[PDB]
Design a protein around this ligand. Structure first.
Ligand SMILES: *[C@@H]1O[C@H](CO)[C@@H](O[C@@H]2O[C@H](CO)[C@@H](O[C@@H]3O[C@H](CO[C@H]4O[C@H](CO[C@H]5O[C@H](CO)[C@@H](O)[C@H](O)[C@@H]5O)[C@@H](O)[C@H](O[C@H]5O[C@H](CO)[C@@H](O)[C@H](O)[C@@H]5O)[C@@H]4O)[C@@H](O)[C@H](O)[C@@H]3O)[C@H](O)[C@H]2NC(C)=O)[C@H](O)[C@H]1NC(C)=O
Ligand SMILES: *[C@@H]1O[C@H](CO)[C@@H](O)[C@H](O)[C@H]1NC(C)=O
Length: 233
């Protein structure tokens, strides 16, 4: 069994640079399955699709494998000053066009990209798990601020429409960060409010696994332990 990870710098090996790391790097210790971390810094659901990264996972994935998809951090912004990452606004079949990198590109909504990827993987027999993006430092101002992005609910909607599993990674990380306190969570963010240090990546990875056990996600079957702090929800 192989577990494929598709995500951004919050998940990728080497994180966002300068000593940060991604949470996908701390998953393998807890699974009896091979983990292939295909997350890449700077990618959104759009650019990951455009660069052929979802397609490449589709090529090697086999029946019984898992694919965990988690995007959102790089998905916002404005299409007027197109950075190649911003998705089209909307929750459904809406379509946008923008000239980026010498191509009049057809741009889909965030949910559309995730649904399309899930359909490719599911048709081959892989188990797909859409996961909401991790939160940016909620203690940044000294007090706890709980503010999810639209991509948190969008991921849930995508899982509903595609008929796959959903893991609310956002809530589980924000819940544990709230209990950790100001001084500790701030120490997890060395250079900005997004990229986690190795300790913060470990906490983020454990929170994903806490979400899996609490919700009963299929991945539970290759989980080596359920000993993680926090509570369900
Ligand atoms: C939530 O937790 C926070 C982190 O644990 C905590 O904030 C810390 O509080 C301690 C205790 O009071 C402070 O320690 C004291 O720091 C001063 C020197 O402070 C100044 O210099 C530091 C370091 O500057 C350099 O490094 C940083 C990071 O690499 C660079 O950004 C920077 O360019 C320099 O190279 C700097 O972090 C401090 O910044 C804070 O203060 C200013 C206003 O005063 C703000 O503009 C800024 O947003 C930030 O709040 C500051 O410029 C030293 O002289 C003392 O001896 C003592 O060591 C920490 O500085 C402080 N750290 C931070 C990031 O704030 C909070 O108290 C807590 N929140 C609440 C509400 O309780
Ligand atoms: C891109 O293609 C769409 C139709 O597919 C068209 O309506 C739009 O004008 C094109 N954009 C540019 C800049 O040519």
């Amino acid at each position: 069994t192989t577990v494929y990870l598709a995500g951004d710098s919050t998940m990728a090996k080497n994180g966002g640079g300068s000593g940060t790391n991604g949470w996908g790097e701390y998953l393998a210790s807890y699974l009896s399955a091979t983990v292939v971390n295909d997350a890449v810094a700077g990618r959104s659901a759009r650019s990951y699709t455009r660069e052929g990264r979802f397609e490449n996972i589709a090529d090697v994935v086999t029946a019984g494998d898992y694919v965990i998809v988690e995007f959102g951090h790089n998905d916002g912004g404005s299409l007027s000053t197109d950075n190649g990452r911003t998705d089209c606004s909307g929750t459904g079949a809406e379509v946008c066009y923008s000239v980026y990198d010498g191509v009049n590109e057809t741009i889909l909504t965030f949910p559309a990209y995730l649904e399309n990827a899930a359909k490719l993987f599911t048709a081959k027999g892989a188990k797909v798990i859409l996961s909401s993006q991790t939160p940016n430092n909620p203690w940044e101002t000294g007090t706890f601020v709980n503010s999810p992005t639209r991509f948190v609910e969008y991921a849930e909607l995508a899982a509903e429409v595609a008929g796959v599993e959903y893991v609310d990674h956002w809530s589980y990380v924000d819940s544990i960060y709230e209990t950790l306190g100001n001084a500790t969570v701030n120490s997890y963010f060395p250079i900005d409010h997004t990229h986690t240090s190795p300790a913060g990546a470990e906490v983020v990875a454990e929170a994903f696994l806490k979400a899996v056990v609490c919700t009963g996600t299929s991945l539970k079957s290759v989980l080596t332990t359920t000993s993680f702090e926090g509570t369900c929800l």
